[PDB]
Amino acid sequence: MQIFVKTLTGKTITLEVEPSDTIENVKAKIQDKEGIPPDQQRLIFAGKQLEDGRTLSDYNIQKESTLHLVLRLRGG
Amino acid sequence: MQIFVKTLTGKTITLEVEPSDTIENVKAKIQDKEGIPPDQQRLIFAGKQLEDGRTLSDYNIQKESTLHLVLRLRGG
């Protein structure tokens, strides 16, 4: 299925995912597309930051959802 | 069957396709005609971006439909 990922610079990319994909694997797919390692990504859906070990399914993320990517350095 | 592909420059090309063709194969047919590799193509029908692994059939695209080609560099 298809989901969207939009950034703070307004940009939107699309991903080919399955609900069974982990959030970490979704970041790998962003990395495959954009070159940014997963640990520099934060993914947000409905205002909650998604945990790497859970799935799109666990968050009831259906096709044509938009996740929000926020880049953040390893830490804070 | 015959479908149309129109671009942002107004141009329209025609393709000889079957409903069972994948969207990726449709981009290969554009590539055979225009020289543009599939991963530089985005195909849109009724405002939704088509996924490479699905078929014209999956989208209920009938003969004499017009798809919309948008060129986009590998990424965003």
> Which secondary structure element, helix H or strand E, spans residue B29, and what is its range?
helix B23-34
Distance CA A39, CA A52 (A): 10
Give the strand pairing for B41-45 and B12-16.
unpaired
Chain B contact for A12 (CB, 8 A cutoff):
yes
- Number of CB pairs, chain A paired with chain B, less than 8 A apart: 16
Q: Which residues of B touch A14 (CB under 8 A)?
A: 49
Task: Give residue for tokens 């939009």.
Answer: A6
Which residues neighbour B44 within 8 Å (Cβ) at sequence distance 6 or greater? B50, B67, B68, B69, B70
- Look at chain B and count its residues: 76
Backbone phi, then psi, for A54, in 5-degree steps?
-90, 175
Distance CA B73, CA B40 (A): 5
Chain A contact for B53 (CB, 8 A cutoff):
yes
Interface of B with A in 56-75 (CB under 8 A): 75
B10: left (phi over 0), alpha (psi -120 to 50) or beta: left
Chain A contact for B52 (CB, 8 A cutoff):
yes
How far is Cα of residue B8 from the mean position of the Cα atoms in its chain? 13
Query: A68 to chain B nearest CA, in Å?
Result: 15
Distance CA A4, CA A16 (A): 9
Q: Which residues of B touch A1 (CB under 8 A)?
A: 51
Query: B37 to chain A nearest CA, in Å?
Result: 16
Technique used to solve these coordinates: X-ray
Distance CA B27, CA B33 (A): 10
Q: Inspect the interface and report whether the beta carbons of B53 and A11 lie closer than 8 Å.
A: no
Strands (E), chain A: 2-6, 12-16, 41-45, 48-49, 66-71
